[PDB]
Amino acid sequence: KPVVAIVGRPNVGKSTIFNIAGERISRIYSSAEWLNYDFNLIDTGGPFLAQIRQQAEIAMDEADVIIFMVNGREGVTAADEEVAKILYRTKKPVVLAVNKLNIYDFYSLGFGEPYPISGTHGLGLGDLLDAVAEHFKNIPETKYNEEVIQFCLIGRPNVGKSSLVNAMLGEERVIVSNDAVDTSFTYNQQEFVIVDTAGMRKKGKVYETTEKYSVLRALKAIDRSEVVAVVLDGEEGIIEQDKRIAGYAHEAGKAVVIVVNKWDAVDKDESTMKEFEENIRDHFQFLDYAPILFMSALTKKRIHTLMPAIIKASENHSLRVQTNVLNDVIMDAVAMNPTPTHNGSRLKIYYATQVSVKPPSFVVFVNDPELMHFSYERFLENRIRDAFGFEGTPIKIFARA
Numbered sequence: 001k002p003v004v005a006i007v008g009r010p011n012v013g014k015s016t017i018f019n020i021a022g023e024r025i026s027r028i029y030s031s032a033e034w035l036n037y038d039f040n041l042i043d044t045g046g047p048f049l050a051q052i053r054q055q056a057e058i059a060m061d062e063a064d065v066i067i068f069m070v071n072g073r074e075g076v077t078a079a080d081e082e083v084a085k086i087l088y089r090t091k092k093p094v095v096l097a098v099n100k101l102n103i104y105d106f107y108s109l110g111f112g113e114p115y116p117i118s119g120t121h122g123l124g125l126g127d128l129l130d131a132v133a134e135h136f137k138n139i140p141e142t143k144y145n146e147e148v149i150q151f152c153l154i155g156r157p158n159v160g161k162s163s164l165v166n167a168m169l170g171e172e173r174v175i176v177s178n179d180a181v182d183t184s185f186t187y188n189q190q191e192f193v194i195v196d197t198a199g200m201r202k203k204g205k206v207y208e209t210t211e212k213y214s215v216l217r218a219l220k221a222i223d224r225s226e227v228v229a230v231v232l233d234g235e236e237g238i239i240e241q242d243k244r245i246a247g248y249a250h251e252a253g254k255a256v257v258i259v260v261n262k263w264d265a266v267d268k269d270e271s272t273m274k275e276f277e278e279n280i281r282d283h284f285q286f287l288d289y290a291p292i293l294f295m296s297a298l299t300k301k302r303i304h305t306l307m308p309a310i311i312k313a314s315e316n317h318s319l320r321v322q323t324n325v326l327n328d329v330i331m332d333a334v335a336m337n338p339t340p341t342h343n344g345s346r347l348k349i350y351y352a353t354q355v356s357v358k359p360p361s362f363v364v365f366v367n368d369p370e371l372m373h374f375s376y377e378r379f380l381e382n383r384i385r386d387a388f389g390f391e392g393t394p395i396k397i398f399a400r401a
């Protein structure tokens, strides 16, 4: 079922590698017999920059996974950087392949680990194809246009999720559209989809006789979303079940916004809001990046703040940083906070780059990864946040030799 395209400037060796393909499906090719993997290929044959652009465009729309190819003998070229600069506009997985041949500043292209390959005898192909196949189980069951922002609202039953969605969808800036498990709409003319509103529209038809299926349904909604709105009940406060879904959204690397509903019903004061906020921070210690919003679906108070926060969390989730700035910020962290020694060896940081988006992920090339301690990693994380923002999203840092 899965579809794969190969993209790159001309003369990097795409034809040799492509020619992994068996027989044409009458365009689309099936994978050859020797491959222990099951997928289809899409051809992209059919001034210099605009004719490269056509290929990448088609690949981005149809392919589930994209192999980005460069030439090892040339190194990274501006032409490669341009193809890179197009491929940034997709949320579909890209895997980088270095042909003809060392593997240092291909990380600069910003797609992570470069997989070296030769086409004469197919050296490196196993590793490449394993890397591509790993993405197959994360392919969207339901497919939307690239522009659409997908988010979910999850929480415990009777926290007012349905009320919130109806309160949100009844605003002047919103236009509701017209696979009716999801709700489509625009807000300030941007397209959005709320994942799994069917499970939210379930009651009235069905008695929910146990939470265990609701929770598993919510985990699946999360898998499909870029932003997760975790809704807490203002009246009752945080109980133990709240933590599970939220931890899952965090571990899955999704953008998160915390929403406290039913704020109309708490006995307010300036102190009451700040106490509830710090209580969230104590119970949800892994969601420090997540903004907290107080609103009432009932009386419509501060409902207008929800969509701007989803947009912003979504923007930061997809943010791609410049390498020179990134390395300046990390060297500024090392200068303000000298690295801890380890018996007799000090951590040295050579170079940093971004390896992916959604969530933002960074690789730091070091001496030895073991000397990079959890606490110092957290320190780098915080320094990265102060320089770039990143509100609403987790970020990942990995040290590599």
Ligand SMILES: Nc1nc2c(ncn2[C@@H]2O[C@H](COP(=O)(O)OP(=O)(O)O)[C@@H](O)[C@H]2O)c(=O)[nH]1
Residues within 6 Å of the ligand: 009, 010, 011, 012, 013, 014, 015, 016, 099, 100, 101, 117, 118, 119, 120
């Ligand atoms: N030495 C070496 N040369 C290669 C390899 N793969 C491709 N080439 C050469 O690079 C050239 C570029 O291939 P090309 O047919 O332009 O593929 P395109 O990317 O679809 O244009 C080919 O003529 C190959 O001879 C390789 O693994 N090793």
Ligand SMILES: Nc1nc2c(ncn2[C@@H]2O[C@H](COP(=O)(O)OP(=O)(O)O)[C@@H](O)[C@H]2O)c(=O)[nH]1
Residues within 6 Å of the ligand: 155, 156, 157, 158, 159, 160, 161, 162, 163, 164, 200, 261, 262, 263, 264, 265, 295, 296, 297, 298, 299
């Ligand atoms: N006091 C108060 N009650 C609310 C608010 N929002 C929803 N409710 C009530 O909470 C109950 C559960 O609402 P529902 O939308 O079914 O929550 P869901 O289980 O998350 O879908 C309903 O009876 C609503 O009347 C609010 O902002 N304030």
